[PDB]
Swiss-Prot record:
Function: Mechanosensitive channel that opens in response to stretch forces in the membrane lipid bilayer.
Compartments reported by the entry: Cell membrane
UniProt tissue specificity: Detected in the root tip and throughout the vasculature of the root and leaf.
Transmembrane segments: 1-19, 31-51
Annotated family: Belongs to the MscS (TC 1.A.23) family.
Superkingdom: Eukaryota
UniProt-recorded name of the protein: Mechanosensitive ion channel protein 10
């Protein structure tokens, strides 16, 4: 539910950034002293960075699970500080 909305927003932001990079029509417009594509890429950076932080935390957890290390204290520390 909530995660689906975030994923859709991230996908939309990525598509908009790709369109702006490929198409120079949007580059012709600017606001706040900067090009619109730059601001769109920045906002997409914020949101997709939250999403990528979540994904990277999941990937790091998966890698630690596959790692040969099995220390109890390390597992608790990772769970607490993730």
């Amino acid at each position: 539910t909530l995660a689906l909305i975030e994923s859709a927003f991230f996908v939309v932001i990525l598509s908009a950034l790709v369109a702006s990079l490929t198409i120079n029509v949007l580059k012709h417009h600017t606001f706040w002293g900067l090009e619109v594509w730059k601001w769109c890429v920045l906002v997409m950076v914020i949101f997709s960075g939250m999403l990528v932080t979540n994904w990277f935390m999941r990937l790091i957890v998966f890698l630690i699970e596959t790692n040969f290390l099995l220390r109890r204290k390390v597992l608790y520390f990772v769970h607490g500080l993730k």
